[PDB]
Design a protein around this motif. Structure first.
Motif, PDB file in Angstrom:
ATOM      1  N   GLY A 100       1.029  -1.197   0.005  1.00  0.00           N
ATOM      2  CA  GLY A 100      -0.041  -0.091   0.010  1.00  0.00           C
ATOM      3  C   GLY A 100       0.922   1.326  -0.087  1.00  0.00           C
ATOM      4  N   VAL A 101       0.159   2.446  -0.506  1.00  0.00           N
ATOM      5  CA  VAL A 101       0.719   3.863  -0.224  1.00  0.00           C
ATOM      6  C   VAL A 101       1.658   3.978   1.110  1.00  0.00           C
ATOM      7  N   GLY A 102       2.748   4.222   0.998  1.00  0.00           N
ATOM      8  CA  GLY A 102       3.617   4.845   2.248  1.00  0.00           C
ATOM      9  C   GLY A 102       3.843   3.603   3.166  1.00  0.00           C
ATOM     10  N   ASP A 126      -0.873  -1.528  -5.113  1.00  0.00           N
ATOM     11  CA  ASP A 126      -2.116  -1.440  -5.402  1.00  0.00           C
ATOM     12  C   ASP A 126      -2.963  -0.530  -4.843  1.00  0.00           C
ATOM     13  N   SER A 127      -3.817   0.252  -5.126  1.00  0.00           N
ATOM     14  CA  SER A 127      -4.725   1.201  -4.481  1.00  0.00           C
ATOM     15  C   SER A 127      -6.282   0.744  -4.986  1.00  0.00           C
ATOM     16  N   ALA A 128      -7.244   1.696  -4.144  1.00  0.00           N
ATOM     17  CA  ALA A 128      -8.584   1.713  -4.919  1.00  0.00           C
ATOM     18  C   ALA A 128      -8.311   2.682  -5.984  1.00  0.00           C
ATOM     19  N   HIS A 177      -4.658   7.030  -9.469  1.00  0.00           N
ATOM     20  CA  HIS A 177      -4.194   8.332  -9.967  1.00  0.00           C
ATOM     21  C   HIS A 177      -4.358   9.573  -8.837  1.00  0.00           C
ATOM     22  N   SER A 178      -3.595   9.507  -7.991  1.00  0.00           N
ATOM     23  CA  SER A 178      -3.720  10.108  -6.618  1.00  0.00           C
ATOM     24  C   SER A 178      -2.311  10.437  -6.051  1.00  0.00           C
ATOM     25  N   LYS A 179      -2.177  11.558  -5.374  1.00  0.00           N
ATOM     26  CA  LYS A 179      -0.728  12.128  -4.958  1.00  0.00           C
ATOM     27  C   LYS A 179      -0.089  11.220  -4.087  1.00  0.00           C
ATOM     28  N   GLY A 180      -0.839  10.327  -3.240  1.00  0.00           N
ATOM     29  CA  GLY A 180       0.010   9.409  -2.353  1.00  0.00           C
ATOM     30  C   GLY A 180       0.492   8.414  -3.232  1.00  0.00           C
ATOM     31  N   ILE A 181      -0.029   7.841  -4.357  1.00  0.00           N
ATOM     32  CA  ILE A 181       0.530   6.935  -5.066  1.00  0.00           C
ATOM     33  C   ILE A 181       1.595   7.407  -5.759  1.00  0.00           C
ATOM     34  N   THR A 230     -18.008  -3.378  -5.875  1.00  0.00           N
ATOM     35  CA  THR A 230     -19.160  -2.581  -5.890  1.00  0.00           C
ATOM     36  C   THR A 230     -18.996  -1.336  -6.171  1.00  0.00           C
ATOM     37  N   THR A 231     -17.704  -0.798  -6.536  1.00  0.00           N
ATOM     38  CA  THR A 231     -17.130   0.619  -6.477  1.00  0.00           C
ATOM     39  C   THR A 231     -18.198   1.346  -7.407  1.00  0.00           C
ATOM     40  N   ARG A 232     -18.399   1.052  -8.818  1.00  0.00           N
ATOM     41  CA  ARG A 232     -19.405   1.679  -9.619  1.00  0.00           C
ATOM     42  C   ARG A 232     -20.667   1.925  -8.876  1.00  0.00           C
ATOM     43  N   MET A 274     -11.383  -7.214  -1.663  1.00  0.00           N
ATOM     44  CA  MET A 274     -10.423  -6.502  -0.567  1.00  0.00           C
ATOM     45  C   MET A 274     -10.959  -5.594   0.121  1.00  0.00           C
ATOM     46  N   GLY A 275     -11.835  -4.939  -0.522  1.00  0.00           N
ATOM     47  CA  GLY A 275     -12.394  -3.612   0.216  1.00  0.00           C
ATOM     48  C   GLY A 275     -13.805  -3.861   0.675  1.00  0.00           C
ATOM     49  N   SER A 276     -14.048  -5.354   0.907  1.00  0.00           N
ATOM     50  CA  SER A 276     -15.414  -5.742   1.673  1.00  0.00           C
ATOM     51  C   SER A 276     -15.185  -5.729   3.322  1.00  0.00           C
ATOM     52  N   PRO A 302     -17.702  -0.198   2.556  1.00  0.00           N
ATOM     53  CA  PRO A 302     -17.034  -1.139   1.755  1.00  0.00           C
ATOM     54  C   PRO A 302     -17.251  -0.667   0.246  1.00  0.00           C
ATOM     55  N   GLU A 303     -16.297  -1.308  -0.562  1.00  0.00           N
ATOM     56  CA  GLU A 303     -16.516  -1.371  -2.011  1.00  0.00           C
ATOM     57  C   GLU A 303     -16.482  -2.541  -2.786  1.00  0.00           C
ATOM     58  N   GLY A 304     -16.670  -3.884  -1.729  1.00  0.00           N
ATOM     59  CA  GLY A 304     -16.798  -5.082  -2.300  1.00  0.00           C
ATOM     60  C   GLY A 304     -17.456  -5.987  -1.705  1.00  0.00           C
ATOM     61  N   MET A 353     -16.201  11.679  -4.318  1.00  0.00           N
ATOM     62  CA  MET A 353     -15.440  12.674  -4.437  1.00  0.00           C
ATOM     63  C   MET A 353     -14.017  12.621  -4.622  1.00  0.00           C
ATOM     64  N   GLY A 354     -13.655  11.568  -3.631  1.00  0.00           N
ATOM     65  CA  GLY A 354     -12.047  11.127  -3.762  1.00  0.00           C
ATOM     66  C   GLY A 354     -11.582  10.875  -4.826  1.00  0.00           C
ATOM     67  N   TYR A 355     -12.454   9.978  -5.651  1.00  0.00           N
ATOM     68  CA  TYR A 355     -11.994   9.374  -6.900  1.00  0.00           C
ATOM     69  C   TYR A 355     -11.836  10.471  -8.082  1.00  0.00           C
TER      70      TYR A 355
HETATM   71  C1  LIG Z   1     -10.021  -2.075  -4.982  1.00  0.00           C
HETATM   72  C2  LIG Z   1     -10.977  -1.440  -4.233  1.00  0.00           C
HETATM   73  C3  LIG Z   1     -11.794  -0.783  -4.716  1.00  0.00           C
HETATM   74  C4  LIG Z   1     -10.801  -1.559  -2.586  1.00  0.00           C
HETATM   75  C5  LIG Z   1      -9.626  -2.140  -2.125  1.00  0.00           C
HETATM   76  C6  LIG Z   1      -9.426  -2.180  -0.807  1.00  0.00           C
HETATM   77  C7  LIG Z   1     -10.179  -1.302  -0.236  1.00  0.00           C
HETATM   78  C8  LIG Z   1     -11.147  -0.465  -0.539  1.00  0.00           C
HETATM   79  C9  LIG Z   1     -11.885   0.575   0.335  1.00  0.00           C
HETATM   80  C10 LIG Z   1     -13.090  -0.073   0.448  1.00  0.00           C
HETATM   81  C11 LIG Z   1     -11.568   0.679   1.549  1.00  0.00           C
HETATM   82  N1  LIG Z   1     -12.115   1.587  -0.646  1.00  0.00           N
HETATM   83  C12 LIG Z   1     -11.299   2.622  -0.861  1.00  0.00           C
HETATM   84  O1  LIG Z   1     -10.194   2.394  -0.247  1.00  0.00           O
HETATM   85  N2  LIG Z   1     -11.811   3.741  -1.574  1.00  0.00           N
HETATM   86  C13 LIG Z   1     -10.974   4.895  -1.945  1.00  0.00           C
HETATM   87  C14 LIG Z   1     -11.734   5.813  -2.955  1.00  0.00           C
HETATM   88  C15 LIG Z   1     -11.254   6.971  -3.293  1.00  0.00           C
HETATM   89  C16 LIG Z   1      -9.997   7.153  -2.868  1.00  0.00           C
HETATM   90 CL1  LIG Z   1      -9.150   8.846  -3.478  1.00  0.00          CL
HETATM   91  C17 LIG Z   1      -9.230   6.527  -2.219  1.00  0.00           C
HETATM   92  N3  LIG Z   1      -7.914   6.551  -1.776  1.00  0.00           N
HETATM   93  C18 LIG Z   1      -6.606   6.741  -2.353  1.00  0.00           C
HETATM   94  O2  LIG Z   1      -5.972   7.850  -2.076  1.00  0.00           O
HETATM   95  C19 LIG Z   1      -4.725   7.512  -1.598  1.00  0.00           C
HETATM   96  C20 LIG Z   1      -3.569   8.341  -2.261  1.00  0.00           C
HETATM   97  O3  LIG Z   1      -3.401   9.675  -1.914  1.00  0.00           O
HETATM   98  C21 LIG Z   1      -4.658   6.056  -1.559  1.00  0.00           C
HETATM   99  O4  LIG Z   1      -3.864   5.654  -0.508  1.00  0.00           O
HETATM  100  C22 LIG Z   1      -6.082   5.666  -1.675  1.00  0.00           C
HETATM  101  O5  LIG Z   1      -6.555   5.525  -0.173  1.00  0.00           O
HETATM  102  C23 LIG Z   1      -9.573   5.180  -1.496  1.00  0.00           C
HETATM  103  C24 LIG Z   1     -11.483  -0.503  -1.892  1.00  0.00           C
END
Ligand SMILES: C=C(C)c1cccc(C(C)(C)NC(=O)Nc2ccc(Cl)c(N[C@H]3O[C@H](CO)[C@@H](O)[C@H]3O)c2)c1
Ligand SMILES: C=C(C)c1cccc(C(C)(C)NC(=O)Nc2ccc(Cl)c(N[C@H]3O[C@H](CO)[C@@H](O)[C@H]3O)c2)c1
Ligand SMILES: C=C(C)c1cccc(C(C)(C)NC(=O)Nc2ccc(Cl)c(N[C@H]3O[C@H](CO)[C@@H](O)[C@H]3O)c2)c1
Ligand SMILES: C=C(C)c1cccc(C(C)(C)NC(=O)Nc2ccc(Cl)c(N[C@H]3O[C@H](CO)[C@@H](O)[C@H]3O)c2)c1
Ligand SMILES: O=c1[nH]cnc2c1ncn2[C@@H]1O[C@H](COP(=O)(O)O)[C@@H](O)[C@H]1O
Ligand SMILES: O=c1[nH]cnc2c1ncn2[C@@H]1O[C@H](COP(=O)(O)O)[C@@H](O)[C@H]1O
Ligand SMILES: O=c1[nH]cnc2c1ncn2[C@@H]1O[C@H](COP(=O)(O)O)[C@@H](O)[C@H]1O
Ligand SMILES: O=c1[nH]cnc2c1ncn2[C@@H]1O[C@H](COP(=O)(O)O)[C@@H](O)[C@H]1O
Ligand SMILES: [K+]
Ligand SMILES: [K+]
Ligand SMILES: [K+]
Ligand SMILES: [K+]
Lengths: 355, 356, 354, 359
Positions: free
Chosen positions: A112-114, A133-135, A138-142, A191-193, A273-275, A283-285, D315-317
């Protein structure tokens, strides 16, 4: 007025057209690049999920010539212990095994990030690739984490995701990744979308990213939404260099989950993973189950078998040729209905076709 | 988009025939057509070359009713020769029987790549047409088999397939086929499009290939994906000279296999030639093993099918097939427009011969 | 290189757009024209089928301001008998009744191609309108029958169908019809599009014919495929002067036939006229079926007209003519149709118009 | 040819494209405007339905940053006594427990009340009772009756905020804004329990509706309430991204503790009644809605929490720091039927039921 950018297609909107062919399915090469610097003998990666990849499944994947990515839903010690179990194994029963300079099976590991301490650990355990891998890749942390890892470990191959746009690809390749994973929404357990409204259909996703990623010589991993070998072939033909798969591998001997019996049949549990289960708020799963299907090796044999039949239909000697030759048609729903089995009750198990 | 999307392809359910002015009654329209440049049928239906559809018993009725059966290749040369001869030696009850210059029933027989010994025997057994069938007709293997057979038997009518593009139709024609089979994946028991991602919805396929094959004067056989009599009509209206049918003929008296019971009703096996069970006589199939309902005699099934074809032609106002293709105009429909086209909002009490 | 003329819509592909309304649904006018010379006080015609309309139902349709058509699946005298009963049936209870100049209720009668002796007997019996139907109205058989009838009975109003194209609409209007029936394959019990591959989705087919028949001043009857009241309104907003209905009326008391129970629920038999049972080496274009029993015709018609009025209210139209001038549509997706129906909610109490 | 104005998209027809993001879901601000003059701390309003909002439900929604609207299917004294119960709930402990409460200058929770056309005597009694906003709702807001009632209320009570609906077209939005309303409620047909598209053939798919009114009502500086059709948290996000300033929800809040009515069991599962106001039971005759039941889902607080959580994630997306940034950044794709089937759960049997996914 609102901004609609494109009309975006997924796997079931398109089919490959047949072309003139002088090659047989068994003759085609499925060698491919996983990152700028690592190749694969077959284009499949088992997913970085606690219900899919752990040391056992990462071993079979490498032995058959692809890769597995140890998941990160475990403490640093454990991921090191899983990685070391892949590096200690070895493969004539496995001619195409995917090994390293010392003749050890290749393995990937998710971070994960950081999480620098975790990369420190995985690097000294001998990990071949780190999958950040992140959700939302396309983010500043990544990006920050990407540059920070390529500073400390310039010779370490790094995969970052997940993304779904040309913009996201340009940004990561510029931060110095060695491959981009593509997929926001496609996964069977995702379930993200639905919970956030965000996502890009996977065929249009892959197409957008490969066009940008290629400008940097950076391979694209197509992650999620593969339901049949045919979806692999579509993913590779649009220009992805490898496919990451979860749901189709989780019901195998080799995946970490235990087997159980519900109402006559055997299942393994498969969960995002996001369940809720895997995170133990929003959650998103989902958590589910899939039917037990036997060995990874046989599931893999059929998937590659369909990829080979596809390349023979298109007329391609290798993957790169596949991608030059590929032409598509868009179908309608009724065309999907006719592509599947219709008007006949299936009565025996087909090894590469279920519903 | 940086991926090459050539067109948007339609299948049988995306279109409907517009009715036209009509001066002809369905009983008076002429349904004769061409199987190949030199063989004619009295009606435009062919039996699929499948080990659950066509054998000598089924091939005989098809010829007697005006069409043609293709004996499948899932057997040794000795057996297939024997099947071919039973039809030829079969010979006012069947007045539209499709016969050869000697008055024997016409019959077809399937072959595969480089089975030249199989062709030698089937010619000597007097087969009228040899069907060179393969999952991918547009390949060196099939082209070379075409040119080889047409060099050895220049008067034997050859069919080759399956194809689904103009480029393919062009290749086979210049290699000298006398007719092309169009159809990559429409088959009811086919999983090609799913297992490999390759396919072309059948209506766009037919249309595309007919345009090319016409330049060579070469008929086109529309193969698979036909669910109702209406599809036979659509398929011919686009340019196909005849239609080959599998699942609608597998549940009949005359197909090979035996009837079996499952929860009160009778069935018959029906399977892809690309299925595990058919191929077993490690594999990556492209077909499935299934069952279909027992539907009585082929004669009953052919009657209803041609009946709706005659109905269609009456709506279009066409005296014969070749006029049906000049007059035919299509409407493209939405998915919801098909919900309305089938039966809707009413529970069916009694079964219909032409509709399930 | 095949000929795909257009992309054709049916009811489920469109919705009416709301407009500014200065009118309330109670106060809009729903009179219309059946033929060039016969008007209706409400735009609904009960279908000419042996499971829908006979004298009992035709009397009710006319009493509420519409019209029934007596089906042709009976000998001439028996059809004469039915029309005569409608005619001799004959103010506070049914104020909107559709009557002729002699105060008798109005009735139609269906006939087939070449059936001139039946027409004579019906003209004799007092039929207001003769409905000459066929699977294919755009044929020489039907045009010649139009020409013959109009020659022998000039002042007799004639309806002909079914058709689905402008060119067909022109041909019937030139042969002197006083209305056309549009509908090839939209019927709930019709298998024409599956058996013959022939059809035109109803909304596009009404559109195409209405434009053509207005040039002659010929009303268009929209026949078949009406599932809910909102399709009544879509049918008329596009141009139809009336609509014909089968399934929504077959399950009533006045529909000919008797009820039967299957699995603790009551049902009426409902079958297409081209089904095997309505005809008896035949090739049907319809199926034999059953619809739920929904009580009186009056209750069904009240809801149907109640959705038409409300729709007029949304568009803001005083009468059907204004409705057609103001109507604007959107086209929807299959997803948009899921949202337009009830979704996500079990329905505990069944609605009268849903 | 029949006049076909456009092809209209509903929620399942579109998705938001992710963009570069420097924000975390927990840091984005979700505050929004309800009318030209009344603010919300969250963008959700509970629907003006006799099985959704009453004083108990209205209170909880104001406590969480939103608003309730008391239905009009009760006599005036009944509606006034329920408006007052909200205003009394807090006068000026539960300020550190609900730190985001939506209060007036007096510190009391904010409350809306519904009225029908020509009900000025109702309006009078509601204004004296302290109501913050009166919502004038109708099956058809683009009509002389609604617009004259709007004129009469804004003339008698110049400084009383008024919402008016329901509308679905720019022309309607232009008319209501010109009659001096302070917000428009967009929504003809999308409601879970509505049958207007089926009985009358009328309606506009909800995404296109919102998009057509926002473009116009913005010209007047007037916010749009997206009303009905919300089945998942992602719908809230899409509705807002298109330009709506707040969302009204019925179905997702009717099976809660706070919802009016009582629980009942049917085949060993617990439900609440949830019916459209135009249904037969709700009109004490040609209905435009049906009478249903909804699964019991516990407290309104947990439901709201997941819904807002999904929005924050959206929004974060997109990378947006506030709802205004959300709208200026948002970009969409149109998807096919197979894309929507891909977007859901597929091929896996859902064994455990997620607190924000029920199909
Ligand atoms: C595969 C999926 C969907 C999944 C897997 C595990 C867990 C998750 C959970 C359910 C926890 N949802 C997210 O985490 N949602 C999410 C949505 C928008 C944003 Cl912007 C972010 N944050 C990103 O911004 C930071 C960088 O700056 C990164 O660390 C990251 O956190 C997270 C989802
Ligand atoms: C009807 C179907 C689909 C079917 C029926 C029975 C069996 C099959 C099987 C399942 C065996 N699948 C194929 O054989 N798939 C295939 C795909 C691509 C290619 Cl390129 C080829 N090879 C072609 O090469 C030679 C000419 O060059 C031809 O004989 C052919 O072998 C084959 C499929
Ligand atoms: C409502 C339907 C569909 C229906 C109802 C009852 C029965 C039918 C049947 C099942 C009998 N089908 C037809 O009759 N099909 C048909 C198709 C094309 C043509 Cl061209 C024709 N010929 C027409 O031409 C003459 C006038 O010119 C007419 O007598 C007619 O014979 C008929 C169908
Ligand atoms: C949410 C819905 C759908 C609903 C809620 C409760 C009840 C209803 C009912 C079921 C009663 N149906 C309508 O009322 N249908 C309607 C249709 C068209 C028009 Cl034009 C109008 N007239 C409107 O314009 C006048 C202007 O002053 C207003 O009084 C109002 O009557 C009403 C429906
Ligand atoms: O719970 C989560 N929410 C959304 N996507 C996930 C989650 N967990 C894993 N994924 C993604 O889904 C992919 C598996 O997709 P599948 O092979 O179609 O089931 C993985 O490779 C991940 O990229
Ligand atoms: O298993 C196979 N895989 C793919 N196509 C097949 C296979 N076996 C038969 N077919 C094709 O399917 C057609 C039958 O289609 P049907 O009319 O839909 O049942 C035959 O004419 C063949 O061309
Ligand atoms: O047997 C048939 N085959 C095809 N169409 C039929 C048949 N019988 C009646 N119809 C048509 O279907 C209409 C009624 O359809 P419905 O209103 O949808 O049930 C009638 O008015 C006829 O035009
Ligand atoms: O009976 C009715 N017919 C049509 N719409 C209704 C009716 N009752 C309430 N509504 C609307 O539907 C919305 C609820 O939609 P939901 O969020 O999908 O349940 C409410 O905000 C109202 O605007
Ligand atoms: K198929
Ligand atoms: K139909
Ligand atoms: K609805
Ligand atoms: K998904």
């Amino acid at each position: 007025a609102m901004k609609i950018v494109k009309r975006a297609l997924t796997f079931e909107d398109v089919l490959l057209r047949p072309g003139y062919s002088e090659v047989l399915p068994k003759e085609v090469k499925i060698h491919t690049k996983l990152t700028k610097n690592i190749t694969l003998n077959m284009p499949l990666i088992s997913a970085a999920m606690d219900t899919v990849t752990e040391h056992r499944a990462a071993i079979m994947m490498a032995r058959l010539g692809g890769l597995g990515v140890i998941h990160k839903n475990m403490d640093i010690a454990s991921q090191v212990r899983e990685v070391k179990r892949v590096k200690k194994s070895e493969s004539k029963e496995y001619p195409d095994a995917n090994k390293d300079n010392f003749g050890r099976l290749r393995v990937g590991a998710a971070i994960g990030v950081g999480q620098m301490d975790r990369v420190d650990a995985l690097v000294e355990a001998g990990v071949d690739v780190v999958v950040l891998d992140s959700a939302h890749g396309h983010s500043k942390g990544i990006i920050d984490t990407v540059k920070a890892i390529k500073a400390k470990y310039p010779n370490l191959d790094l995969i970052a995701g997940n993304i779904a746009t040309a913009a996201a690809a340009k940004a990561l390749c510029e931060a110095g990744v060695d491959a981009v994973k593509v997929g926001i929404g496609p996964g069977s357990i995702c379930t993200t979308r639905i919970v956030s409204g965000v996502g890009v259909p996977q065929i249009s996703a892959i197409d957008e990213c490969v066009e940008e990623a290629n400008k940097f010589g950076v391979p694209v991993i197509a992650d999620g939404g593969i339901k049949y070998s045919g979806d692999i072939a579509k993913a590779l033909a649009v220009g992805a260099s490898s496919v990451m798969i979860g749901s189709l591998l989780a019901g195998t001997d080799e995946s970490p989950g235990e087997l159980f019996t519900y109402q006559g049949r055997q299942y393994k549990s498969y969960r995002g993973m996001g369940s809720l289960g895997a995170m133990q708020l929003v959650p998103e799963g989902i958590e589910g189950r899939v039917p037990y299907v036997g060995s990874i090796r046989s599931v893999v044999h059929q998937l590659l078998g369909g990829l080979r039949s596809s390349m023979g239909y298109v007329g391609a000697k290798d993957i790169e040729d596949f991608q030059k030759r590929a032409e598509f048609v868009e179908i309608t729903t009724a065309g999907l209905k006719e592509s599947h089995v219709h008007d006949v009750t299936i009565t025996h198990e087909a090894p590469n076709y279920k519903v």
